[PDB]
Ligand binder design. Sequence first.
Ligand SMILES: Nc1ncnc2c1ncn2[C@@H]1O[C@H](COP(=O)(O)OP(=O)(O)NP(=O)(O)O)[C@@H](O)[C@H]1O
Ligand SMILES: Nc1ncnc2c1ncn2[C@@H]1O[C@H](COP(=O)(O)OP(=O)(O)NP(=O)(O)O)[C@@H](O)[C@H]1O
Ligand SMILES: [Mg+2]
Ligand SMILES: [Mg+2]
Ligand SMILES: [Zn+2]
Lengths: 227, 304, 703
Amino acid sequence: QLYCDRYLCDKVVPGNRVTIMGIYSIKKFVGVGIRSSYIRVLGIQVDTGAVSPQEEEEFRRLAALPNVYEVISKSIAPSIFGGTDMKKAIACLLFGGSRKRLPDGLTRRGDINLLMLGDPGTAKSQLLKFVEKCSPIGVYTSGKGSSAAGLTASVMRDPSSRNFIMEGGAMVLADGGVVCIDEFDKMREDDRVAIHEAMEQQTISIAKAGITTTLNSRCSVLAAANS
Amino acid sequence: SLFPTIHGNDEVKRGVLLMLFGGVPKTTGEGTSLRGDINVCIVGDPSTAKSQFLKHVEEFSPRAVYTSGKASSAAGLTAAVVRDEESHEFVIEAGALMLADNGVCCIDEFDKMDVRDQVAIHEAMEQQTISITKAGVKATLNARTSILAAANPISGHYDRSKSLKQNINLSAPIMSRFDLFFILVDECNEVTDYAIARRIVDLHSRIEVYSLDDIRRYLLFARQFKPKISKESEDFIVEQYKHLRQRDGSGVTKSSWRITVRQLESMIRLSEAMARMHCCDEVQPKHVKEAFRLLNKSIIRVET
Amino acid sequence: ESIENLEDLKGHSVREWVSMAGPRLEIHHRFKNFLRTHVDSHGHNVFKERISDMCKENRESLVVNYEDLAAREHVLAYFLPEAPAELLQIFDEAALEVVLAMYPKYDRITNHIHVRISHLPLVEELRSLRQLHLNQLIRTSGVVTSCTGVLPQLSMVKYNCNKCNFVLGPFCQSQNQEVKPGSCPECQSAGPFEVNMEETIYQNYQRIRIQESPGKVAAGRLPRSKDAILLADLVDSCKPGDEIELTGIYHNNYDGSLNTANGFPVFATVILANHVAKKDNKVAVGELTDEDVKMITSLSKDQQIGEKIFASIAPSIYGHEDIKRGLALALFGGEPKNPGGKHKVRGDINVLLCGDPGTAKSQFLKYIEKVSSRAIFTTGQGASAVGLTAYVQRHPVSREWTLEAGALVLADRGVCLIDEFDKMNDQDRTSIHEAMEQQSISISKAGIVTSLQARCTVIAAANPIGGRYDPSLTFSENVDLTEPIISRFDILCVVRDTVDPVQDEMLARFVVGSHVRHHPSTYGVEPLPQEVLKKYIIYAKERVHPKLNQMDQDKVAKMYSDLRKESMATGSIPITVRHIESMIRMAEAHARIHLRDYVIEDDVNMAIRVMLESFIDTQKFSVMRSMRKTFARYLSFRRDNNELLLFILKQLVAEQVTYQRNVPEKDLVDKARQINIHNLSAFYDSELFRMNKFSHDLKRKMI
Ligand SMILES: Nc1ncnc2c1ncn2[C@@H]1O[C@H](COP(=O)(O)OP(=O)(O)NP(=O)(O)O)[C@@H](O)[C@H]1O
Ligand SMILES: Nc1ncnc2c1ncn2[C@@H]1O[C@H](COP(=O)(O)OP(=O)(O)NP(=O)(O)O)[C@@H](O)[C@H]1O
Ligand SMILES: [Mg+2]
Ligand SMILES: [Mg+2]
Ligand SMILES: [Zn+2]
């Protein structure tokens, strides 16, 4: 348990990797002489969006040089021999298109969904494991290890309050990023059905337990499967 | 004395008696067990005395269990995993083999199991354990049990022209588990029918060599003996098993039992059971001869 | 000063007796002397070595064996189970001031040392605990079902006065009730108080629930259970699912909740732990002695060590030398790595034993379960997808969703054994893909989105279609498994019960020999003892990390390429990189078997041999001749190389004799270390130099 104070609030979100500097201390409100412990945070360091001007100059130079597309394609999964067109597709997925809101209010998704069917032992899972690492927001899931609620969103009773509350699945945790669904063909059909709204409309509409909302799922789905 | 109601079938009575006496269980130097319990299967038409054998065994022995191949519970011959609402948590319901641990499990309708039981029977028969690994429970459960199976052949009647493998639906891995196979076929003999009717009727009228309590005491006393294997009996066993394998090699190309090391160990266990019956200090060549006689007749009547 | 005594005679009770100052000091001196004078059977000062091995790692906990405490000091062993808390406190003090004699600066590292008693002979079944065992030291065994987190518990608490700055002096916290001051001595205000959180001394606390193991006595009956308290360094000694062996004080206290529940003055009970072992991790690298390391490293010097290790796996099984070899390579395992810090590849080796009934496949799996630590066993329909990988449940007391370890997570650095693998359901069988290659188990369920580590070597056994393997078909044509699951197994093994009367005689004689040998009462090399093998494996998997620097890249690449070419025409599946990496892992495993820090050409040859022999086994019987000739001639079935060393020896002898007429073993091995022929021992155990009348002697070095 962590305690964040004043300007440390909302400095980090779920799914982030951090180094926490703080004071290990007891909460001070089975067994008798026991006290629960927590860390009073006084410094947060995101271990991996505010860029420095020097970094911005580097990024502008990278965008300006003529072979940046080939440079990015070579940079994606450099340990993986071959598969250069698939690496280029992964580059397009990572950078993504542009979301557009049209005059009648309808929105078009900019995210790119990429399926990799094929033979085993062909570095598909390794490419997914690279993309999870490389994307600014990235969540890796096994298809067989997933569920409809766990992918999109779960409704559960809050133990301390008796209300039903929302829990973000992988597609909410990866909002603004990439979902890497490995062994995608092993999912049951009813669970693959759950992601249809989130893949295209980029929303998760929920009507369960009297709570009714439309969460955002602005994310790219990168999937791998065997024949 | 143990099978007075049964008419004939002396070889089957002898085999089931040896099943009651059983072989010596052993542990290798590497902490890995060697099976001592034998397993006996009795295939026959529904009109024959196959159920009578199982009923007599379960009436006689203590700690034994009778069950059908089909389960009267969520757990069957082997354990199953069930929630209990006292915790809404998974636990294991025990099956018939576990209830028959360190005992005898009589399984009627052996051919009509569920797939879960039929697969778990592979581990239970040989390794004498049931290894459950599901949500909320991981357990290697003990099933140190001798199994007395009763089976129905396909189409009811046992077809002598077909082999035993063609008669029953038991897979080859299952058939290798059993130490003895016995065949009961309903002959149309007039004298046999009269003898069966007479035995039933005069036994039913009588109710108003050894008693079952005496046999229980002798069996419990005899099972404490752990016969060794004499050198001459070792040579007899290895000679007879080499002869058995080369005899099977003469017809291995056709569909056949395709004998394995499990039948060598079945021969060893049967000789040990003979020595246990007579309370001998070690297995003798005569015990090996009787064990090989029973086993070899089982081979021949399985093949033919 | 207080005078020494005969200890065993007194009018007091044992607790009162050892509490008194005189006998307390005598006990202290006796345990000090026992630590500083106890010796092994060979005469090694045991506790000097143990204290040095403790102070090196800063473990601040000294393990003592009862079975030699009783040998050295009788009365201490007498009082220990009778008054354990008092005697263990005295032992702690004596051990502390022995350790501060051996390492005087160790008080900088820790101010207190705990004596942990092991091999206590008064073991008790968990359901057999009674009032007779209260406040006595017991030993029990059971599976850990529940654990709290590691929590800080008050041990020496100072209270700030409720109305002023004063700190009320230290109160020693108990496990029965929260100790309290009552009223302050500087000013007699009373009632509530504040703990001084900075000056108060805390200790680690963890409460576990243990119950009887499922296979021990619970034959359809519900198992009994007890709570245990782990303090200080004993926390994190165990996790749920651990078959632990627990020594501790059986302690009881008043509990009003139990009183109202039962309607009687019923006292709750708990085990104050003093030692936690595990009944599967019978040996560990943290417990290996210098003599164990010395005899392990002496065994590695033998050139026959590979054959000895292979012969030492499942020694009660005749034949199946290829199976024993593959299982040895999997049991030792390769080296995991992450080149560039961005690309993981597994080090563990997976094996599949396919074949017909009555061929000891399940017996091999049971042996591997027994020999290897952190091993688990499962079978067919008994396994499930969820149980194999991981399961999400309502937590029993919190009722919030919690993720829990499955089979491959509980064996995260061990072996998962899956017997009768062909008979699983497809949804159960496909669940292990991620665990078998990516060595993680990724779960996205009920709000939990996380990936667990599953760095597990999977060894599986199966039958082909119809039970009996037919040589008329390839492995792929009669196994019924698919390519994504087949290709994840580094080693494929085929066993066939084909008739051969001489081999049948040998096998049957060995089986009868095993049956008569193990009464309750192809090897040619003799095995290691299994205790030695367990020590060897656990040493080699931690103290050795084989590196790779050169493996004849073009040779392996050519081998893999034409292996792919031949496989395209037939029925087993070398998917591109998995078989290359299987060979790399097997070379690393062979180096680990030989305790080599760096992989050599012999290890690479062994890996190539294993891969190619397994591939040849998967072919049709008619095709094995052509396939075997193809790989054997060109692709490095490097049996021996005696001719070069023969003519090198003859050349050196010819030059030497010519020089003499107008130390030869050194002259021989100099040219042998110059040319790439360095394994000269084969030349000395080969007849080629013998019929040329050459011979060797390690002392004289003349040839
Ligand atoms: N072209 C390649 N370059 C480098 N490594 C590769 C290549 N192809 C396969 N591999 C390696 O092969 C192993 C298995 O790769 P993996 O990522 O599982 O491929 P996959 O097609 O996803 N396997 P699967 O889940 O059965 O479909 C890893 O160690 C990869 O690094
Ligand atoms: N070469 C052998 N040496 C010693 N015992 C053997 C040998 N081959 C088979 N056995 C014995 O055969 C028995 C059955 O072993 P088991 O491991 O169950 O075979 P299996 O390969 O699993 N057959 P299956 O379960 O039908 O696939 C055991 O008692 C083994 O000791
Ligand atoms: Mg994959
Ligand atoms: Mg088996
Ligand atoms: Zn005050």
